[PDB]
Write a protein that binds this DNA or RNA. Structure first.
Lengths: 96, 380
RNA sequence: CUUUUUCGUGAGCUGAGCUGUGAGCUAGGCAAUAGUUCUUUAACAACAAAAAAGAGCACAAACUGUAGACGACUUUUUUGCCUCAGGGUGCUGUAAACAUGAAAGUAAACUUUACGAUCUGUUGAGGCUUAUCCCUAGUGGUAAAGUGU
RNA sequence: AGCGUACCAACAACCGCAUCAGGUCUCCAAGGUUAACAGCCUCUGGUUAAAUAGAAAAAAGUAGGUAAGGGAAGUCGGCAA
RNA sequence: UUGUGUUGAAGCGAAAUACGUGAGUUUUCGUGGAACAUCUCCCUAGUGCAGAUCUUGGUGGAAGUAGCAACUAUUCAAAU
RNA sequence: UCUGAUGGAGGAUCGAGUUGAUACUGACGUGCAAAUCGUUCAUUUCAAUCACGUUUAGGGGCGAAAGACUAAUCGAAAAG
C-alpha cells in the first residue's frame, strides 16, 4: 500500500489521435499509466477525475493532469486514481 | 505494336531488388585498389549523422558566372568520435575468393565492443572475450608471421565508441578497414603499432578531400508505385483508383516481367554515393570548431538549441559538402575514393567564410544564445 | 609353438645400456578333415549397453523509433531507460486581473457620478514546445520471471 | 341496441424472402439569427441505437481539404472542381 | 427341385498362399441381429451407369477467407 | 401625351417542401437495395401534387405515343 502524486502529460498521449477520440484516449492512457506505476491490474478512476478529463468535450482534454494514485488491499491489491485540483503545474514533480 | 511515344523507363534496374537492407550499418562492397608505393594507411571510417547546416565559401572557378562571389552551400555534419583498433584479419587470394587465414585480437577490448556480441548484455554475465585474450605472445606472433607470409590483403578490425555520442545504443559498431599501402610486412607493423589505441578521423582523412559515403537510406515502409518509381498518375476519371501502373505487361510473355514497377518497400536501402568533399575536420579539443577567419567568433558546430533529433556534437566531426543518405543518428561509413581523384573540384582548397549555427528548429535569427540574450535584453 | 641367433623401431632409465616390436637365420615336431558348391557372412561408417582414462545463451517482457500492414528490424533494462520538473531552442503574439487610467460621445446632480466598441500600463506578456526537438548523477519509478536449448 | 376500442404505424411490429440505408396517406408544431416552416445552434419531448468491438495506422480504395509559378498547355469534350 | 439360418440370415468394413482372362464367384475376420438362397431346369422384368449445364439428397477446396463501413460519440462508477 | 403613387394580373421569376431524375457516365455493382446512396440538377398557382373510392381486362384495355404501361411478367399478361 502506497500513495503517489504524479502529473500526466496528456498532450503527448493524445497527440496522434482523432478529434473524436481524444478524451477517451486520455482516460485509457491514465488507466494504463496508473496500472503500470502501481503494478496492479485493477485500477479505478474517480468519477470526478472522469468529469475533469471530459470537462472541455471530447475534442480537447487538459494537456496535463495532476493525479493521486492510492494502493488498497481489497488480485488483492488495486489502485484508486483521483483528480487533484492545482492552481498551476510548474515545478510539480512525482512524489511518493 | 510499338509505343506511340517513347520515354525512358521509370527508375533504375541497377538498384534491384528494392528490398530492405540486411543491416543498419553501411558495408563496403569493395575497398580502393591497393597501391604498393604509398605508406600503409587506413581506408575507411565510421561516424554518425548529426544533421545539416549551411556555409559560405568563396568560389575560385575562373570563367564561371560565380567565380569571385561568396556562395552558400549545404553541408552535412558527421560526428566522428575516434574508433578503437581491436583486431587484425588477413585474407589470401584463392580461386574461390578471399579466404581468411586468421584474425588476431588485441589484449584488451572495451565492454562497448563486447556488447555487440550480445542480444541481452544486461542479463548475461559478459563472458565473451574473457579467456581468449590470455593467449601467449608466442602464438600471437606465430599467427602474425603466418599472416605476413601467406596473406595478401590486411584489414584492421576497429569499432566506434557510441558512449561518446548522444546515442541511446551502447553496443559499438564494428567493421574492418582495409590497410592499403606498402608491403605485407609494413602493413602488419603499421597496424601492430596501433593495435589498441584510438584512431581519429584526422589520421584517416584530410580536409578538401573527396570521399565516398556508404549508408542505409531513410525508411518509408511500403510505398505505392507512384512514389516508389515515379510513374505518372492516371487521369481523375479512373474507375478503381489512379495511383497505379495501367498496363503491367503485354499479353505475351504470359507473365509479369521483373522490370515492371510495383508497390513495395521504399527506403531503408543500402547506397554508396561518390564524391562528397570534406569541407572541414572539426576537432573536439578546440572551442572555435565552427569559427572561420572571417568570423573570429568563439562558437562550436552544434547549432543553437542542439542538433534536432540528434543531440550535441561533443567530439571530432567532419563537415561534408552536400547531403548523405540516412536519417539522423544513422551510422555512416566514409571510404577513400576507389582511385584518387585529380579533377579541379577534387583538388580545390575550400576556404569557407561562415558556418551557420542558428537554430535549426524554427527559423533561428541568432548564432549564439549570448547573442539572443544580448538582443532581447532583460525579461520577466 | 620350441631352440640357435642377426639387423632395423616403441616404453621406462641414462649422446647411452635394457624391455617391447618389425624383418630375418639353424634345427625340430605340430594343426587343418563337417561327406560335391548355394555370399568366401571377411568393407566402411554409425549406434546402444557396460567397463577403463581424462572434462552459457536466446526467446518472451518492459523500453526504444534510425523501423514498421503484421512479422521483421534498431535499441535500452540501474553512470541506462521511462516519467515529470527545471533549463535551452523555437511557435504564437502581449494572458487573466487591476488602475480619481484613456476613449467618439451621451445623461444626471449641485465642479462630481454613471454608460462606452476600443486603447494603454503592469506585459516581447501568457500559452504551447516531442508525443520522432536538445541538456540535466534534478523528482519518482524501473514490474511476476514464463519459455527453449 | 349491436359492432370497433390493446399495441406498431416503421426508428425492428406494414410491403420489399429479413430485425433490409428502400417504399408508404393525415394533423400539431417552441427559442436565436433570418426574408424564411431554409441552414446552423438551443428549450420541451426523445436518444446516446444501429449484423461487432480493440489496437495499429503503411500501400491501395473511398468521401474530402490545401497547394508555389503557370492558368485548359489536360481531355472527344473544362468531365470534375 | 434341395437347401442355409439365434451355436447368427441379409447387409456392410477390411481382407484372401482362393478360382476365373474377364464381368464376377467363393471364402476369412470384424460388425450385424432375422431372414436367405437355389448353377437342377425353366419363366418373368420397372434388370446392370462416369458423364446427359441429368434428378434428389449429402459433402468439399475456396476459407477461418471476403466480410460484419450510411446514420459525427463515447466515458467513469455502481447493481444484477 | 407625360410623371408619382396605388393596385395585385400572369399555364410570370427565384426557391425549401413535394413531385421527379440532368451530370459525376461518382459510390455500389458476391450492393443497404433484383435500381439504393452522395453531391449536383429539374419542379412549386397550375395541363400542379397526394389519398381513398370507382370505371376500362388480354389480340382486350389504357397511352401529351416510348410499342410505353396493364402486380419485378408485355412487339400480345398471368394461371391451368
Amino acid at each position: 500500500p502506497v500513495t503517489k502524486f504524479i502529473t500526466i502529460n496528456l498532450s503527448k498521449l493524445t497527440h496522434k489521435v482523432c478529434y473524436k477520440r481524444k478524451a477517451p484516449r486520455a482516460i485509457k492512457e491514465i488507466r494504463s499509466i496508473a496500472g503500470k506505476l502501481m503494478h496492479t491490474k485493477d485500477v479505478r478512476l474517480d468519477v470526478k477525475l472522469n468529469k475533469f478529463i471530459w470537462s472541455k468535450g471530447v475534442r480537447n482534454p487538459p494537456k496535463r493532469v495532476r493525479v493521486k494514485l492510492e494502493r488498497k488491499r481489497n488480485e488483492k491489491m488495486y489502485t484508486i486514481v483521483e483528480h487533484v485540483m492545482v492552481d498551476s503545474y510548474k515545478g510539480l514533480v512525482n512524489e511518493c | 505494336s510499338h509505343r506511340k511515344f517513347e520515354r525512358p523507363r521509370h527508375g533504375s534496374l541497377g538498384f534491384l531488388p528494392r528490398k530492405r537492407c540486411k543491416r543498419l550499418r553501411g558495408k563496403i562492397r569493395s575497398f580502393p585498389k591497393d597501391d604498393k608505393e604509398k605508406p600503409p594507411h587506413f581506408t575507411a571510417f565510421m561516424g554518425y549523422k548529426a544533421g545539416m547546416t549551411h556555409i559560405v565559401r568563396e568560389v575560385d572557378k575562373p570563367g564561371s558566372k560565380l567565380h569571385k562571389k561568396e556562395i552558400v552551400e549545404a553541408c552535412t555534419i558527421i560526428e566522428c568520435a575516434p574508433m578503437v583498433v581491436v583486431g587484425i584479419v588477413g585474407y589470401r587470394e584463392t580461386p574461390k575468393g578471399l579466404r581468411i587465414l586468421s584474425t588476431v585480437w588485441a589484449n584488451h577490448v572495451s565492454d562497448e565492443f563486447r556488447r555487440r556480441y550480445y542480444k541481452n548484455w544486461y542479463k548475461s554475465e559478459k563472458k565473451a572475450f574473457t579467456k581468449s585474450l590470455n593467449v601467449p605472445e608466442a602464438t600471437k606472433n606465430c599467427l602474425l608471421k603466418r599472416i605476413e607470409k601467406y596473406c595478401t590483403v590486411l584489414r584492421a578490425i576497429c569499432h566506434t565508441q557510441p558512449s561518446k555520442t548522444p546515442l541511446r545504443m551502447k553496443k559499438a559498431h564494428i567493421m574492418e578497414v582495409q590497410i592499403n599501402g606498402g608491403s605485407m610486412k609494413e602493413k602488419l607493423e603499421f597496424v601492430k603499432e596501433m593495435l589498441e589505441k584510438n584512431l581519429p578521423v584526422s589520421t584517416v582523412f584530410n580536409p578538401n578531400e573527396m570521399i565516398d559515403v556508404i549508408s542505409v537510406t531513410k525508411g518509408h515502409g511500403t510505398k505505392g508505385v507512384v512514389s516508389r518509381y515515379g510513374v505518372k498518375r492516371l487521369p481523375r476519371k479512373t474507375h478503381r483508383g489512379l495511383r497505379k501502373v495501367a498496363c503491367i505487361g503485354a499479353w505475351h510473355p504470359a507473365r509479369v516481367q521483373f522490370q515492371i514497377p510495383r508497390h513495395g518497400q521504399k527506403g531503408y536501402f543500402h547506397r554508396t554515393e561518390r564524391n562528397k568533399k570534406i569541407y572541414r575536420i572539426g576537432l573536439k579539443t578546440d572551442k572555435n570548431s565552427a569559427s572561420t577567419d572571417a568570423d573570429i567568433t568563439e562558437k562550436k558546430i552544434t547549432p543553437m538549441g542542439g542538433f534536432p533529433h540528434y543531440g550535441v556534437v561533443n567530439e571530432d566531426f567532419l563537415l561534408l559538402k552536400g547531403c548523405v543518405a540516412g536519417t539522423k543518428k544513422r551510422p555512416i561509413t566514409l571510404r577513400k575514393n576507389i582511385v584518387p581523384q585529380v579533377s579541379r573540384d577534387a583538388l580545390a582548397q575550400v576556404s569557407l567564410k561562415f558556418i551557420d549555427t542558428s537554430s535549426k528548429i524554427g527559423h533561428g535569427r541568432f548564432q549564439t544564445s549570448e547573442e539572443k540574450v544580448k538582443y532581447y535584453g532583460p525579461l520577466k
